Amino acid sequence: LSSNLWAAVRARGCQFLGPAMQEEALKLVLLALEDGSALSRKVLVLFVVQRLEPRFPQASKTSIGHVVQLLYRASCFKVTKRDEDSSLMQLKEEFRTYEALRREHDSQIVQIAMEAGLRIAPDQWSSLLYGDQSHKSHMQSIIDKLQTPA
Question: How many domains in the chain?
Answer without folding.
Answer: 1
